[PDB]
Amino acid sequence: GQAVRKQLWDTANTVKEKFGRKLYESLLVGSLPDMNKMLDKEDFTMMKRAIFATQRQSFPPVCTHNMLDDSSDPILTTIRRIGLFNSSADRVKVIFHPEFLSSTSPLLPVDYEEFVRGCHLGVFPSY
Amino acid sequence: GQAVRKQLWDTANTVKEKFGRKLYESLLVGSLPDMNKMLDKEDFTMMKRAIFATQRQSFPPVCTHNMLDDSSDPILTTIRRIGLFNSSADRVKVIFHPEFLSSTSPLLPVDYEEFVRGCHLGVFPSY
Amino acid sequence: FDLENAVLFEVAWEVANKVGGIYTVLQTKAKVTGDEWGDNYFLVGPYTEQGVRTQVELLEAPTPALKRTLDSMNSKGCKVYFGRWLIEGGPLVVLLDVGASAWALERWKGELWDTCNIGVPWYDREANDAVLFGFLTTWFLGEFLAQSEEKPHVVAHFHEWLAGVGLCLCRARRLPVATIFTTHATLLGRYLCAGAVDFYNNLENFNVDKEAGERQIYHRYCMERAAAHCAHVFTTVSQITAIEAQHLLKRKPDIVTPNGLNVKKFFQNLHAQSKARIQEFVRGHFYGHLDFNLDKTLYFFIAGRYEFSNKGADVFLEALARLNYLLRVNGSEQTVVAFFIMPARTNNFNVETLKGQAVRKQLWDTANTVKEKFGRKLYESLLVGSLPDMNKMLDKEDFTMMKRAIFATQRQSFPPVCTHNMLDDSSDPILTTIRRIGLFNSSADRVKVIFHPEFLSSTSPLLPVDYEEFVRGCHLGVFPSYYEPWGYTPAECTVMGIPSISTNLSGFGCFMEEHIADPSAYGIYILDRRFRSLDDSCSQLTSFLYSFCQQSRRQRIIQRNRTERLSDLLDWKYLGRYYMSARHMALSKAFPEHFTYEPNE
Amino acid sequence: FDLENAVLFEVAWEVANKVGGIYTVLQTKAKVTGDEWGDNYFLVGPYTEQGVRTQVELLEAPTPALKRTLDSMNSKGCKVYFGRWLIEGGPLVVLLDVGASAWALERWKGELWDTCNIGVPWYDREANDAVLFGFLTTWFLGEFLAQSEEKPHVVAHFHEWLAGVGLCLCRARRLPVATIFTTHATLLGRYLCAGAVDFYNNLENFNVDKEAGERQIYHRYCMERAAAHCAHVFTTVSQITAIEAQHLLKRKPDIVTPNGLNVKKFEFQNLHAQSKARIQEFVRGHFYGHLDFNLDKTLYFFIAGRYEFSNKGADVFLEALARLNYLLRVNGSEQTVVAFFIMPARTNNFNVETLKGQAVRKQLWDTANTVKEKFGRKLYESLLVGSLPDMNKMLDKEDFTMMKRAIFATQRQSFPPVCTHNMLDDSSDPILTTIRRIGLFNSSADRVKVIFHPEFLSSTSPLLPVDYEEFVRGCHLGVFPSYYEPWGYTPAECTVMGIPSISTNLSGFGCFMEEHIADPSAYGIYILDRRFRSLDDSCSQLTSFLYSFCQQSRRQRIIQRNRTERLSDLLDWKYLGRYYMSARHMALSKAFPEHFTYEPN
Amino acid sequence: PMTDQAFVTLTTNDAYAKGALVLGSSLKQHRTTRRLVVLATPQVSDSMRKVLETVFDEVIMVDVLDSGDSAHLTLMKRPELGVTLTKLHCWSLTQYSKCVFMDADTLVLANIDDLFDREELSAAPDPGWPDCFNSGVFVYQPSVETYNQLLHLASEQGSFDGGDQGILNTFFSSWATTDIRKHLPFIYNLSSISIFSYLPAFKVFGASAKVVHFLGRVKPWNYTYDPKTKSVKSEAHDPNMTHPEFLILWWNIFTTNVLPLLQQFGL
Questions:
Q1: What residues does UDP-alpha-D-glucose bind to (chain D)?
Q2: Which of C489, C506, D46, E38 is the most buried (most CB within 10 A)?
Q3: Fold (CATH) for D7-262+574-590
Q4: DSSP element (H, E) containing E35
Q5: Which residues of C touch A45 (CB under 8 A)?
């Protein structure tokens, strides 16, 4: 999933740069950009691959790291039981990240401090 | 002239970045960008102003520097006599830079060696 | 050059499915061949569900001729799909399905026996599937010619033994097709090089029929030899492959068509940034044993699959030990760091390696925080007009952070040779050799070996560096391979500024020798394993490595820049000419009368 | 409350051309009025070539009825254009040209005299232009009604004095369109304030006719008063403007419609800090060598808008600053007040001293960063070896000299300049004269430092290249002790941003805030009661406000800022949309009530 | 509505204020869409500067004796060029993207908003040396840079004629050869000396005159007008009076549309 996000971003950058050049050339001539002529045939093949990449039928995962024992995990067992499988219909999607968040990790590069700062609310109910 | 080039490049960057985001967002949903909708009304105004800046009917100057003594200048007198006034019709455009090319200078901020490397040919009909 | 009514059909097993390196070749050949053959460029290939889903767009036939052809085949109990491969140049791909035609495999095998007397055993999947592919490709070509009433002239460039069945059948059906076969690597060559003690010199001595039979790969051999004999033009990837082909496949390559690489890999700024990142990794890995000067330090690397014999990593490892001895005995400030980036069974980053990178992080963080604080205090002091009191600028608060940082650095144990803890350590050829050679990264050693068992990737926690970026940092790349048909890895290096030592047994090396009279000046050193003994070759490598080491900064810069100019020789633009010749020669060999089908050479 | 067939035509001189603040109102009113009137929202405004290209995309008529109207107008020697303004809400705009004055002299003007017994002098451009505009608008709407199926409800909203000629004619020609006339300012009011000694209290006493005549502005006044009398519903921007209208125009406003702004201006507490940093950098630069003031304790107060000494009550602010200086001096405070007067004047480029000071700040920063970087490298290298930093030796001789030059460049010299740009007339500048008299000369002893920037702050400018909005966000407080401001566009912007802003009873925004907020002070908008106090007592009141702000706790000030961010909703078009909708409904009710009658809100 | 573009003019005294009043009036009569911004030296009386305040949109004040003025240092180098340095302040008017400068001894005969079509320093070929541009009427574009360069030239090399024409011709030498679009038709800046010196052309191309420029020592305001006869004081041959309409059309415009404005403000 993170790799496809990378691919989509990379495709965006390649097409964006090409648009940049063509727009800059067109603006220099003194003509407003001709939409539908900006994108070259290669750019369509690049983007068509990207759109093909961003296709899934399986509902998005509820746990970023694979569990040693998925059945055992109390959090994961409940995520199933409660009826949160992160379906398209669900308005609440649960992402259980088992590893202590670290800067080094490819997914969510933020350190615990920065991830805490990003979140809107911190729900910590404690017995 | 150099400033307008800068403005057009900056504008192209701003529009490029906005296209970048909109393309990335469009790709993330799984659809090839709808080209007409990519550019917002806000940019159409920025780009329209940019193409308004480009508009000129006056031929680009034959020198790059305002000369303290203009009329005397042998090069300029000859350029006028020869008829190379950088007219639209002319295939030969003469640009006289009366200062040693320097890193400090705003235009062509390349030192002599780098400028020499860029040119296709060097004509030195020394007497 | 009269290709108006010629149709190019580059039958291949890797047309959509990335089985191997051949895949990169096709994906890169497609752009240039695209211009030459226009929309007549078709890449017949095997059908993979994953392939069509991600890389193949589905479109309708551009010319009606094929619509009938695809329809007839689709209606006859077979599945064929036409689409645009979404790779650069948008080459139209007809993907035959080798699962859907399973029903007729027994029929196809029967025909093969009568036609080419090449049985394929029941067990082998790679060939059984190839026979299906070959028969289906022959069928496609036959159907195309039949349904297209104005009959064109078709040139079918089969690119491996897997597509070889097609050429055999096509020639026998006597379809009006100019057929080119290509052996990207001789089948027997891979088995013989590892299996036999002296594969290269005994090439003449080896009896192919005997040898292949012994390895139970005979059917696969027979098909590859049959295709070569049958093919109107037989081509090979490299001159070294040609030598193998003459003595093993038994038909001399008509043309040598090198597997060039599209130069979209493409500078000094990038080199510097990459070297800095590499330097930071080194700083981290050595964890307080950083007694060497890093500015003088040189990085050498070997990449590819983890083949000890094939990539001749033993030569590099022995030669590093000799370089160590020479550097230590002579006066050396310069220290060599050799990075063996070869895939292995890694479990996780070794404790020391991970910890080492963390201390680099800590020292960087501590230094940055103190630096920032000093900067602010300096700026404030300068604003007042008072020259900074150096002693006062660092607070007691800083001297605690820095003291902790210095306390972290202290280590006793020499930095590890391998970055990842291996699942199996004893067996690992690289590690065994490192131990034998004596390179334990001891303080005294001038050559320090860092074996990275995982292909360098952005994902990796220690080093989020892509192979490309790491390559751009290292000073030299050493690839003393024994059996590389075309070193893809050395070619990539050369396209990047990096000077690369290659062998006279590698495709890239032999190709460079053939194309440049004085190889050394341009940064590609050609270690001669072909006529030299193993030990003498090692000594030759040591000499090369030492020569590179004993090179002043400015001279090294020249070497690397000369390497960048050798990029054009590898690029498909130039290198496309060799295949274009092969097609034109194929067109000339068969149906000679028609059009302008005559060979210049 | 349903407008079945009503068509809204907001007629104004600033519909596409940014002459004045009215233009911002329309550009901002357009979105909300867009929703209420749908596609029946038409803006009638002057054609400007530059305006049309940058802001307007030309369009074709939505309505066949409209097409007829456009064609008829085009036919009879008028060059009306129709298009979509690219501002939010995409309103349809009919931009008629005032350059098509084919018969305006002695035909249109002639007609006006017969109809309204009013004449326009040859010399006045604005009045002459307005007669052209007014006659054309009256013609357009009259023609539209005639050519289309008769819409009993069409609502024409005239938004300024010079659009009011149209309203006079429309009602006089007995056309059924409902007319709303809105005076964003009183024409006579602007001249009478400043021009007379005591405009505000003597409002009732003034013989408007005499005063108007005396100023050779009589024609303009007559037009404004005529429009007011003519409109069925008369609106005014503020309650203070209403009081002026009651006496000057001799007509009470039927409804008072406050101007509004967008809420699109903006944790998002970065901006106060980021902007303050940018501001703080300028201060450091400007005051180099006199930097004994605590730069975290320093508070920045600003007055902006156009340049009017009396109207924006810059004199009151300056006098109050002198009193604040005395208070801060007598009772020792770490806090220092820096007052920025960002009022545009005609001046030369940045003063030598100011530019040099900024350059010295740049040099000091550059020196600090370079020395910081070198410390960074040496510290990092020292830590990596595993040794103490040794701070004494970390800085090299080379940096010691660079810093020595830096400390020399920051020589105290003379007291820092009061004005960033040297004024064309420094001697007579109303601000500079007062600053000198009051005694604020940026002396080392003074706790109040005045920096007058006579150019509108812009990104292009070399020194403080900060856009007005960003500068406003950085300042702690904004002081706008306005005397005549009909509506405070400047104070309004500040409050929407969350900057606490002094306003006055005499300012329209001030009066509005008093009416809508029970305690002005608590929500961070201070009200000065300049209407019911003498000038000196008002100054003393401002000093009290300024001093209170200065003596606010850091935490208290933070709270105050956050409170202001709630007051944005009072000025948002969503809420203020109610007042104009009321005016429009009242218009329909006043004349021809039978079709649509709505009871008062 | 064209707030971006202006006709500029320079009044150095009350005498040249009457000229400016007539020019301004003539631009209004021919229905310019563009703002008429005068420039007045301190020398123009307060009472006159109210009349100039009525007719002309912005009487921007330029004084080269004030030490705050941008040209003051230059004036100390070139004390003979006070008038010229004042005129050159036309380039300081950066509130406008393009302007037409017109000397106060010009009179407009038809709408010339098409002058705004032309680019920087498009001026009529000067009578006499036809390689210099009569700086009476020149389209031009305001700029601080251009202005500073002009002041530099004024200090460094001054002017050949010790006047605006010289300082402008040296700086914009390109006009003579570079482009013909920069040449304005003589009818846009018709010096009367042309009607006198070369009457035959005027007879043929004079009808089309768009701007008349009153050259020679005796300016239009100096003449005596008897409205009863509608005839100017007739001297011996004066260039202006070669055409008894161009000057008559000055005097009429004055009498009709200025004496009213003048009397109101106390002249």
A1: 184, 190, 306, 485, 487-488
A2: C506
A3: Rossmann fold (3.40.50)
A4: strand E34-40
A5: 57, 84, 86-88, 90
Q: Which two tokens stand for residue D524?
A: 């961070």
Amino acid identity, position B4 = V
Q: Do chain B and chain E touch with ≥3 beta carbon pairs under 8 Å?
A: yes
Instruction: For residue B76, list chain E residues with Cβ-Cβ distance below 8 A.
Output: 173
Cβ-defined contact of E69 to D426 (cutoff 8 Å): no
Q: What angle in degrees, to the nearest 10, is found between the helix axes of D187-195 and D239-248?
A: 90
Question: Residue D270, Cβ neighbours under 10 Å: how many?
Answer: 9
Experimental technique of record: cryo-EM
Q: With beta carbons less than 8 A apart as the criterion, state whether E142 and E99 touch.
A: yes
* Nearest to C303, CA basis, from C523, C509, C492, C489: C489
Half-sphere exposure of residue D427, counting CA atoms within 13 Å on the CB side? 4
Contact D552, D528 (CB under 8 A): no
Q: List Cβ neighbours of A24 (8 Å cut-off, separation of 6 or more).
A: B8, B9, B12
Q: Do chains D and C touch (3 or more CB pairs under 8 A)?
A: yes
Q: Where are the domains of chain E?
A: 1-267
Numbers of helices and strands, H then E, in chain A: 4, 0
Name beta bridge partners: D234.
Answer: D181
Cβ <8 Å between A49 and C53 = no
Dihedral sign, Cα of residue E78, residue E81, residue E86, residue E87: negative
CB atoms within 10 A of CB B82: 10
Round to whole Å and give the CA distance between D190 and D20: 14
| CB distance D86 to D57 below 8 Å | yes
Q: Round to whole Å and give the CA distance between B59 and B95.
A: 12
CA-nearest residue to E177 within chain B is B80
Do the Cβ atoms of D98 and D47 come closer than 8 Å? yes
> Is E55 in Cβ contact with D101 (below 8 Å)?
no
Judge contact between D351 and D419, C-beta under 8 A.
yes
Q: What is the DSSP letter of C16?
A: S
Q: What per-residue string of b and e applies to E9-40 under the rule 16 or more CB within 10 Å gives b?
A: bbbbbbebbbbbbbbbbbbbbebbbbbbbbbb
End-to-end CA distance of chain B: 35
* Cα within 13 Å of Cα(D108), Cβ side: 24
Could you give the C-alpha distances from D395 to C292, C558, D246, E110, in angstroms and in order?
A: 23, 35, 75, 76
Q: Which chains touch D (3 or more CB pairs under 8 A)?
A: B, C, E
Alpha-helical (H) ranges within C287-350 are: 313-329
The residue type found at D83 is G
Chain A partners of C90 at a C-beta cutoff of 8 Å?
41-42, 45
- DSSP label at residue C275: H
- Give me the residue label for tokens 């691959």: A49
Alpha-carbon distances, residue D40 vs C80, D3, D151, D154 (angstroms):
59, 10, 12, 9
Arch. (CATH architecture) of C6-262+574-589: 3-Layer(aba) Sandwich (3.40)
Phi and psi of E14, rounded to 5°? -65, -30
CB distance E36 to E27 below 8 Å: yes
3-state secondary structure of C55: coil
Nearest residue, CB atoms, E179 vs list B59, B68, B69: B59
| Alpha carbon distances (Å) from D591 to C509, D7, D175, D177, D585 | 97, 16, 11, 9, 11
Tell me how far apart the alpha carbons of residues D332 and D550 are, in angstroms, rounded to a whole number: 12
| Chain E positions in Cβ-Cβ contact with residue D423 (cut-off 8 Å) | 68
Tokens coding E208: 């089309």
Query: Which value in Å is the resolution of this experimental model?
Result: 3.5
Q: Is C385 close to D411, i.e. CB distance below 8 A?
A: yes
